[PDB]
């Protein structure tokens, strides 16, 4: 029974919602449970980073965002073949590897290669034996590092490029942004139909010959 200017409300309480009420008094205990397991996870892998393997440079789909850079699922095999690391060795060394990721662009490929190239430089690979085999690390690199890396390894900086204050020329001033935008909007709508008027007229030019 509405009276004197309320909104037409549609509460979804017509079901027996009281049997399925989810209380959140577990929130502080769940935070301790997650945190005490997070510290325990980091103590089992003593020299390894707590966050885990390295994540790639990934741009957003869904043109709403279209500019933000996320932390991806893993490095693709096309990115790994450039850097020279086999796909079954990158998992063991601490590189996230997924086979599903395609690579349509080129600048994003070198972004992930450069991320992997300088990652191998700062990586401290411990030898399997105490007597170090070939292509391990020197004993001088070990003793000054007995700590992990809190947070994600190489945190991804959403960076922009600073522009130089350009001097506007008259050649730029003649450009009409609204007039060109409306022209391109009309060309996209009429691109398919204009291909019909040309082809039947060209077929009508065949009637001139035949």
């Amino acid at each position: 029974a509405p009276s004197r200017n309320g909104m037409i409300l549609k509460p979804h309480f017509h079901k027996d919602w009281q049997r399925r009420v989810a209380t959140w008094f577990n929130q502080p205990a769940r935070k301790i449970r997650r945190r005490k397991a997070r510290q325990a996870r980091a103590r089992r892998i003593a020299p390894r980073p707590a966050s885990g393997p390295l994540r790639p440079i990934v741009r957003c789909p869904t043109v709403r965002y279209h500019t933000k850079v996320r932390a991806g699922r893993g490095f693709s095999l096309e990115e790994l073949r450039v850097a020279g690391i086999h796909k079954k060795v990158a998992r063991t060394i601490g590189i996230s590897v997924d086979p599903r990721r395609r690579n349509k662009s080129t600048e994003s490929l070198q972004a992930n290669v450069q991320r992997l190239k300088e990652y191998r430089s700062k990586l401290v690979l411990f030898p399997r034996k105490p007597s170090a085999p070939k292509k391990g690390d020197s004993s001088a690199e070990e003793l000054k590092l007995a700590t992990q890396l809190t947070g994600p390894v190489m945190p991804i900086r959403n960076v922009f490029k600073k522009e130089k204050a350009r001097v506007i020329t008259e050649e730029e001033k003649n450009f009409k942004a609204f007039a060109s935008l409306r022209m391109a909007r009309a060309n996209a709508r009429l691109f398919g139909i204009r291909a019909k008027r040309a082809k039947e007229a060209a077929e009508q030019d065949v009637e001139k010959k035949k």
Binding site: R4, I8, T62, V63, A165, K176
Partner: protein, 147 residues
């Protein structure tokens, strides 16, 4: 605070603030928005016009990511950049014309609401308005698109 509630002042009154002739029954008018067309029609007509009926076409799988287009006006344009950018303008005998990247901050279309101070600029946006251009071109700037 139940001690500030109206129920504490109603202790003693027989009807408890809900009428003596018509008692507070369970649901006199009906549960919810009962009777949109019947017996509650006047309230729906003179307070919520256009509540009933269909209008327009139906778009089945509508995604908000395609129709994302945040707008910014020319009056709030120099707030996109720092204060030292605009004070280092109309100076040095060059016409510095600093570049303001609209897409970098998180806006797409630039609208022409407001008054633009007299300083030529370069604006980088995915969309523009007709009235937006003539204010910038009237000042002496230039618009550059980006994708």
């Amino acid at each position: 605070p139940s001690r500030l509630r109206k129920t504490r002042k109603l202790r003693g009154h027989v009807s408890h603030g809900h009428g003596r002739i018509g008692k507070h029954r369970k649901h006199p008018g009906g549960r919810g928005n009962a009777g949109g067309m019947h017996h509650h029609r006047i309230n729906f007509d003179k307070y919520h016009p256009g509540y009933f009926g269909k209008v327009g076409m139906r778009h089945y799988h509508l995604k908000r990511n395609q129709s994302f287009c945040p707008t910014v006006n020319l009056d709030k344009l120099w707030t996109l950049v720092s204060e030292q950018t605009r004070v280092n303008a109309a100076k040095n005998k060059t016409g510095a014309a600093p570049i303001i990247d609209v897409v970098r901050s998180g806006y797409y279309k630039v609208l022409g609401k407001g008054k633009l101070p007299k300083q030529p600029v370069i604006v980088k946006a995915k969309f523009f308005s007709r009235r937006a251009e003539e204010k910038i071109k009237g000042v002496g700037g230039a618009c550059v698109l980006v994708a």
